[PDB]
Amino acid sequence: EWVRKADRAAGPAAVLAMATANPSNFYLQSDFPDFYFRVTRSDHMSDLKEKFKRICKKTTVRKRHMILTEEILNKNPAIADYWSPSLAARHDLALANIPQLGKEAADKAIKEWGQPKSKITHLVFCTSAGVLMPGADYQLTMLLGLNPSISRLMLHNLGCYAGGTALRVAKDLAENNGGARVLVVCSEANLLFFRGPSETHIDALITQSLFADGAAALIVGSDPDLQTESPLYELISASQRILPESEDAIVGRLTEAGLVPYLPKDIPKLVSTNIRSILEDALAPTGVQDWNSIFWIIHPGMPAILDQTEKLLQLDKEKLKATRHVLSEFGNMFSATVLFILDQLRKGAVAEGKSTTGEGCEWGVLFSFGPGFTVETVLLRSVAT
Amino acid sequence: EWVRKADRAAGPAAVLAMATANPSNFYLQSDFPDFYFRVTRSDHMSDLKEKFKRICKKTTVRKRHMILTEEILNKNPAIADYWSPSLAARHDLALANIPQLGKEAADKAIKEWGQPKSKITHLVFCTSAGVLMPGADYQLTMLLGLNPSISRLMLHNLGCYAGGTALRVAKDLAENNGGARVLVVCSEANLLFFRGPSETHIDALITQSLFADGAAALIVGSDPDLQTESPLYELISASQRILPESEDAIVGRLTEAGLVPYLPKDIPKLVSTNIRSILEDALAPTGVQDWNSIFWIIHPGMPAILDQTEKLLQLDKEKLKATRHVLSEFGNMFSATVLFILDQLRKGAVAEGKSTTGEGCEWGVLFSFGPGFTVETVLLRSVAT
C-alpha cells in the first residue's frame, strides 16, 4: 500500500551532524583520589582512600572534565559533604552551566550542518544534572536564538540510557514531519551526584570514580538535501526494554542533598544474560550473523560490561576502540557518552580512511542502559565516505 | 507524491479512550482556609488568613482532591512548614501514590478501549509531583503488567502545559508506527508545591488555593479498527510556542523544600495579547472564522484568563462550560487538567445528546500554558456520535 506525503517525510531519519563539548576544567584520574579526598576534607579516612585509588585505576579512565573546581566546591561546602542540604546550590550551578554547555556543542554541530538555525524545527534535550522550570531546553532556545515556535521535548533525569532515548524520540519526530530538523542535545554533569565519601556507602564512592561532564549535539532529519546536507548515519530502528528479574537494580533517589545512587543487583550479569538476544533482535532485519561485521557503541558506564560483552560475543578487540577511547578520555558523561562515542567512531573512520562512517561496516548497534533495568537499542546504518 | 506504508501508519492520530482518577481524600474550598492554616500550624497570622479566604473564593473552585491528609501532614511536619528540608519525604509520597493514581486512570481507559493491554506499544507519562529514578513510567509499566519492550517517554516537571506536550508526543508516535497504541498518562499532585504560608511570599499562597491532585489516561492510535475501536477525537495539529517578551514569567525552582514558584509578569496579559493570533494560526487549515463554531479546552490554571479570553473573542459563555466545570470540581491538576476537560466535554456531549463528541462542533482547540512562557496548542477534530 501507499499514501501521499501530505506533511510527513519519505525516508528514515538520518544523523546529519554531530559535535561535542566539555567544561574547560578537567582532572587526571591519576591525581583524582588526592584531589577528591582533600577537597571533601576527608583525608583521615585513609583506608577508604586506598579503596578509591584501587577503584579509580580499574576504571581505565584517564581524565574527566568537571564544572566543579576546587574554588567552586569551596564556595559550596555542602556539595563536598557526603550528605548535606545542597540541592538549590547544585541547581544554581546547573542553570549557569548546563544550557551553556549544550550551546557549545550545538554551535559546533550547526556549524558542520551548514544550514540556518532557523530551519531547526524540534529540540530534544536530556539532562540528569538539574531539574529546571523552565528547562534547559528553554534556556538553550533563548541562548541559541532558535525559533520561538520550535517543538521542544525536555527529558529530565532518565539516567544513563537517555542517549538512546533521544535518538528514539528524534527518529519519530524527523520521520513524521516533512522538512523537520531536530536538534538533539544531551548536556550532562555530575552536579547532582557529586558528594564526599562515607565508608558506610561504597556505591556512592564508585560513582565518584566515573561520572563526568560533557555535552553532545546532533542534527537529525529525514529526506536530506544531498547537495547541502551530508548524512553520517541512518536511524533504522530504536527500541527500549526492561530486563527480566531486574527490579531495583539501578535506583537514584533525588533528595535534599542531590542524587544518591543504589546498586544492589549485579549489573554486568544482567547485561551478559540478555545482551545477545537483544542484539540479534535488533539485527534481525539486516541479515548479519557475524557480530564482527558491524560497528559498535556500548555505553561504558561499567567498564567490566565492555570486557564481558567483548569475550562473550568473541569480538575483535578493536571493535570497542571508539567506546574505550571516550571512556578513557572523558569518563561516564551520563546520556551524552554514547553520542560522544558515535562521534569518535565517525572521526576515526574518516581519519584511518575506512570506506564507511561505520569503520568500514554497513550496520551498527548502539546500546545504552540505566534505571529499570532499562536498555535502549538503536540499529544504525553507515554512509559511504 | 506517495510512499509505501512499510512500518508507518496511514491516518492521523486519534484519541480512542480516556478516563480520569483522583485520590479518595478531597477538601471543599469553603473549608480549606480553616484546614490549611490549622495544619500548617499558622493560625496566628490572621491577616494572611483573611487574604487566603478572599483568594480562595475567587478561584471559583468548589473541591480539590489531595493525597495529603491531616494525618500524613502530621507524620511529615516539614511538608507543612513554609520552607523546611522535605524533598525526600515528598518523593516517598510520590513513589507510593503517583504511579498508583496513574494506574487507576489507565485501568479505566483500557476498560473503555476494550483491547488487550498487550497491544499497548508506547507509554507517555508526565508528572511534576516527583522526580523518580526509575520514573513513574517504569513503576506503572510494572503495576499494569505492560510489555517489557514498551517504548516509554518519561516527562518530569514540564509544568502545567505538559497535557498538550503529551498529546503532541503521542501524535508523532502513533502516526509514524503502524499498529502503535500509545498509553498517555498525566498523573499529578501538589506533593512538591504544598507548603505553609508566609506573608513574605504571596505567590506561594495563591498556588495553595488552586493546585490539586488527579490522573488522566488516554489511548492514542492511528488507523483505528472501526469494529473494535471507537475514536473520540482526532489529533490534527500540535504545536508549542514561547510567547514574546515573557522571560521569567513562570519559574519553579526545585529546592531542598520542594518546588517554590515565582510569578512576576502579568500572565493574563501575556495570554490576552497573544491568544488570538495563536488560535487563528491553529485554525488556519480548517476554514473557520467564527470562534463560536468550535469547541474549547483552555487550561484553567488562572481563572481570570478564562474570563478575559471569553470576552475578548466574544465567546458564548457555554463554550467554556466543560473547562469551568473541571476547575470548580477538581482545581488545577497541573498537566492532567486539560485532559480532564477533554473527558468532561466528551461526556457532556453524549449526555446532552449533541451530534459530535465536540458538543456538536467539528473542530476544537486545546490550549495550555506554563513555564517559558510556553503555550501548547492542539487542533482537534470531533467524531459523530
Author numbering:
A (entry chain A), B (entry chain A): 7 to 391
What is written in the article reporting this PDB entry?
In this work, we demonstrated that PECs in agarwood are biosynthesized from a common precursor featuring a C6–C5–C6 skeleton produced by a diarylpentanoid-producing polyketide synthase, hereafter named 2-(2-phenylethyl)chromone precursor synthase (PECPS). The last remaining candidate gene encodes a PKS (PECPS) sharing high amino acid sequence identity with the other four PKSs, as well as the highest 93% similarity with AsCHS1, and this gene maintains the Cys-His-Asn catalytic triad conserved in all known type III PKSs. Crystal structure analyses suggested that PECPS utilizes unique one-pot catalytic machinery that includes the release of a diketide-CoA intermediate, which has never been reported in other known type III PKSs.
The significant difference between the catalytic cavities of PECPS and CUS is principally attributed to the steric volumes and placements of Asn199, Thr213, and Pro267 in PECPS, which form a constricting loop to cut off auxiliary pocket B from the overhead main catalytic pocket. We also constructed Asn199 mutants in which Asn was substituted with Leu199 and Phe199 to investigate the role of Asn199 in enzyme activity. Furthermore, the N199F mutant possessed significantly lower binding affinity as compared with that of the N199L mutant (KD value is close to 1000 μM). These observations suggested that PECPS utilizes only the main catalytic pocket to generate the final products.
